[PDB]
Design a protein around this motif. Structure first.
Motif: not given
Lengths: 420, 420, 421, 421
Positions: A27-35, A207-208, B251-257
């Motif tokens: 998966g992604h190491p930093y955040f859930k990536v929605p597609k 955000q965690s 895409q970097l989620p805009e919830s994180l910054y």
């Protein structure tokens, strides 16, 4: 008064080996990536700094129809599994991985900077990455482990507090679920609730919630169900010293400095936050891929898996390396490189292989006993002769179809055969 | 049900010493360098981060005419070699060597850089070298070792996916051949297939596959032929933190910054990749030039060399120093230095000295047995009373003429004589 | 078939202590400095990264007039010394020292450099120093130790090769002599023959040979005379990553990169050489100033000093500190500093104190035996009674014929040796 | 022939505890600072890199009137103290301290410097500080310890040598006195005599002598009075690589480099000197505040304190932190900071607490004995009844004549020694 389980739970020579196959997640190491699908072909958040909490479901030993009625009689005795051996398998090679933030709140280098000093007016946020604190932990129980973290506590009194004031900090215990974030060197707290900046810690945790196992509370538990086996090994050091931009909420007492000739001097930022670092990762300090035999537990519950389940919490940050996959935007690349013609993706991988040696046990349902079991957990007798833990997220591992008495057919089984 | 070899393979007191002479190979550390001949006088790719897989062929003990008919009868018994002792000799001195790339994808320094910030538009690729992760490993078997690596997995569904999207990652097991690349700190993956950039990792691996031994799979093997002796010792840390240029596919989620005042600002690159480093190389952590005695194997095969062969996989990155040889372009040098009047070449060297102690064994060809051997490998009985491994590339070691019963005449033999 | 020396050399309870006085040598750490005399007051090359190979000559135990004729009879028996204990004394304090080059071939910093990029046209050679790899080794024998190194190999074929091509590399075993250079972190090779640049490695080794002991060959020796005792301990890491200037002789395969927009782009230098470093020097990792007792040797020769001699190879880089002595150019100093008014000299110092415990042994000159000794070395029996090949090599002579003593309690190593019960 | 003291010194079960109170000294870490008095209220040189040599005077056991005459008769027997236990107390917390020089001879950084290059013309002396090599050592004897150092040797011959030449280096043994400077990572030599620059090493040592204990010489001692107990533990590494300004006294041989196009070129400074560093100081590597029991000494003298004295040499650089005290030049502070309104002073502190367990011993003064004692030290018998050479040297006097006590359980080291029955 709680009583050790070794006084009313007799053990047998019946041993079984149980083990899941290879478990892996990418998966992604930093955040859930929605597609947008076809919902969903999204990649989940798979970080090496995530708690891995496996819920191992065991077959009902009373429903087990392989042993003969000579081992016990279902008239005044009932069976329950007791965990004896555990081997946690880790697959990927050892590596160190970075976590960062493009808009990290880094004002000035406060260590030995002779380069320059930054102006506070504009957006003084730099693109900063960091390798987190190194953490290896393992907790075995029959109840999910208890972790602690700091949160924005409720208002002290029926008091109206001004906006921008520092909120009260409250320590909170919560069950550790699969996917929770571990302490990474910035503390164990709710970064979403206590940092409106969204810029003090990397994207991994900004955000965690970072949870730390409450060894003090779980060890002081009456019955010892939360944790009867625990291995921790953590290390960290301060790599770089930094300053935080933003108005100082706490007034620097004028007793602690002298302002100098310009008696208008604004005191510089005095909120210092270091960049953590986990130093070297070596297989000498490795804590997994080894067999561990539970003889005496830390609590009174001596490895007895009530309700035929077993909770395994594990953290391993020694394999935090990140795969970088990139794909060309042109169907085939013209043999000329331009940054606009390549899409860059970061993927992380986790691989486990859980192995266990369980021991069959008898419980003669006398009085005093059973009433003690009733005062312990009424649902133990109720399940003999719904679930509150499905509200939490775990990694399910079904071993009802994987129990085997041929111990010499498995690695952990052979290593356990070196115990007669 | 698979059965331990200690139940159907009786051992004898006949011991032999087998050993190669000095084996050495020189070449280029980064890539095969073709030179038009007279095909070919090319130098091969000889890197310290390569798997060395020796295929050791042993003499047929049944065809061996040295033992007398008192040790066995060719009526119901057959002979097979059993590995007892192994010493892997390493020759060159300890050193650290670099691997790099002139066009490495290094955008920005994210490890507290106050120098400047680079613009992404132009070709922002720097000339970068790095010392890889330190790895020492050794695996002995009668079947080539199994390694794992990540590759571009087949399309998820019969689905048309857009060009530039992240391909699926698939974990794959493959036999480890001589010359394969080891995990170097960037992960175990197919860099040629998953990085069209040809610029994310040094030239050593930018178009190769890094394999890591699948200890989880080889240890869970039924018979245990893949690996009955395993020594690993690896270490690595993050030396420098860097940024990768190229458009972010996720895409970097805009919830994180929080974007700041310029509400139409593109967030900087958030794909961070560290430079690995193997820290200090010391002879205290050395793992070779030592005798290793195999008593109990990890699997059921207890060091029995079926088909009179033995596979030795070894990785040693503690001798990664690279010789730099330079030759003047003029027949004799004019005593003035200019870079155009000197040609620079990089050569690497590997030196080994394999030593073994084998034990002669009998196998009483009963019923129940032999049929078990037939179910194990029909070709075992077929060879007693083609090759599937010639599809792979190994380092051939012919020891059919190198067995000797005078153990006290050899170093490993003497060290083994201190075992009575 | 070679036979263990414990089968034809019976040992006695006669023990002697032998020891050199304090040995010391000073000189220049980088190169021999000739000074026109009055020939000669030159300073020699005395580097902490030099092999110290002592040729210790022992008194002939048969010629020895201290034992009485009760210990042996010169009719069917002969005597030979056997080494039992060794203590190598090191004198100077622990320190780290630098070795460098004013014109070191350093092009660009490849270790995360955002400083600048150097132009290749002009002389892009920086003045670079470095602390070498840390190495401690000790080998005891009766035959000089065997070392390996890479040299410009002989021409591959009767083939005309173009000038400037890479010469063939040949591995070579040679006896390790006193003064030879050790592996310093750049490899064990002939830098004089394989680097015409005279700018790839510091002045210490740029025109010398770095040898590494061939443990693989000496352990596979038939008799084991070259090495029956070995203690090694080395450490090194890569401190700085650099680029080498000069045209790349090997073409970078275009399959491994993408050239970018300037399809004309010359690939940057891709010959990377790191600066070695020996990390911390601590007395916890120290390997000398300790007694070492030889009981069982690695080879068949179990510490027997044939021809009454003993070769001691030792490398100790844990005392690599360099003294900097400076003298004013004016007869008396004017109380004003100018760099032209002070001469700077770099001197290095080595101090040893070799100590040994030897054991007297008998050899009954049987048949089967003696013929075995004859096939081993005819000169052993010939030197007994029923020229020198090593004088071509340079050793540090240590004469102990006048230094043997049976009063073990009078010496430190002797007392430590009496503690064996 | 020298004889072990266990053959002519019989021991008793009489044990005493002796100990100084807390000893402390403050001063300047770099140099003696004279202040015009009222001579003198000056602060002395108190550096953590100084040898602490205590001269412990013990009461005469023959003059001691506490034990009764049943233990011995003063007719044919005499008494002597023998040291059995030692605990060296260190007080201050662990810390690292710097030593520097405002005019340090630092030309160019040779450790991968691409910043710039300095011109040699002007005064290229930088203000440089450094943390010295870490050293812990302890030597106990009845004779002051012997140290070695390199000095400006006497002229080679009665030869007129040119001014500016490198002087001969001579190794010298000297008694280690209290206040002597230890090896700090720049070597053990006479910086005042071999460096006219007064700018090669920090102010701590630029005009002093650094001595290193001559373990080789003291261990080869005949009687073993200089050292019968020794604990060493030192570590150092090279932190920064530098160049030395000043004309190179040794001509760089042209065989070792190629000059390039500018065949008019003085080779850059090729005298490289690293900055030492003692790395991390941890209590795991700590060597003091622990009891040490002497059973067997290294020499023949087995801890016997002849002349009722005991010499304790000790170096502890793990507490080298320096206090910075500053006082305002105005009587009361104006709430405004200016560098001219504050005086800055650097003070260093050392704290010890010496503890000893001594054992009473008898010596029956026979013939053969006593004549052996006479050949050993005539002054031993002369001081009994059958001037001083050490007051010419500087020691830290510790008078324990009134500090002996037989109630061992009243002292910590006494109790730990009672845990030996």
């Amino acid at each position: 008064k709680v009583v050790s389980t070794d006084e009313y739970v007799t053990r047998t020579s019946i041993f079984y080996h149980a083990g899941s196959s290879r478990l892996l997640t990418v998966g992604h190491p930093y955040f859930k990536v929605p597609k947008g699908g076809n919902g969903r072909q999204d990649v989940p958040k798979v970080s090496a700094y995530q708690y891995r909490v496996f819920r191992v479901k065991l077959p009902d030993p009373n429903k087990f129809g392989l042993p003969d009625n000579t081992v016990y009689d279902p008239n005044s005795q009932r069976l329950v599994w007791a965990c004896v051996g555990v081997e946690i398998g880790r697959g990927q090679p050892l590596g160190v991985g970075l976590s960062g933030h493009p808009l990290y709140n880094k004002l000035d280098d406060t260590e030995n900077s002779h380069v320059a000093s930054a102006v506070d007016t504009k957006d003084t946020r730099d693109n900063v990455s960091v390798d987190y604190k190194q953490t290896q932990l393992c907790i075995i129980g029959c109840v999910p482990a208890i972790g602690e973290h700091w949160t924005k506590g409720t208002a002290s009194k029926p008091t109206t507090v001004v906006q921008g004031d520092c909120p009260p900090l409250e320590l909170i215990n919560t069950p550790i679920e699969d996917g929770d974030m571990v302490d990474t060197g910035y503390g164990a707290m709710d970064f979403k609730l206590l940092q409106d900046n969204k810029s003090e810690v990397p994207l991994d945790i900004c955000q965690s919630i970072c949870k730390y196992p409450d060894y003090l509370q779980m060890s002081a538990d009456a019955y010892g169900d939360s944790m009867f086996f625990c291995l921790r090994r953590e290390q960290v050091f301060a790599r770089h010293f930094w300053n935080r931009s933003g108005t100082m909420g706490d007034q620097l007492p004028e007793s602690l400095y002298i302002k100098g000739t310009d008696i208008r001097a604004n005191p510089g930022s005095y909120l210092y936050s270091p960049s953590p670092s986990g130093s070297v990762v070596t297989s000498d300090s490795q804590l997994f891929n080894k067999p561990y035999w539970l003889h005496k537990a830390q609590g009174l519950n001596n490895g007895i898996c009530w309700h035929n389940q077993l909770f395994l919490t594990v953290v391993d940050t020694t394999r935090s390396t990140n795969l970088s996959v990139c794909a060309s935007t042109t169907s085939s690349i013209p043999n000329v490189y331009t940054p606009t013609s390549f899409k860059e993706y970061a993927r992380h991988v986790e691989e486990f292989d859980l192995q266990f040696i369980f021991q069959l046990c008898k419980i003669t349902l006398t009085t005093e006993v059973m009433s003690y079991i009733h005062n312990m957990n009424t649902t133990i007798l109720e399940d003999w002769n719904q679930d509150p833990y499905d509200k939490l997220k775990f990694w399910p591992v079904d071993l009802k179809e994987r129990f085997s008495a041929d111990l010499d057919q498995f690695p952990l089984g052979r290593k356990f055969l070196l115990q007669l």
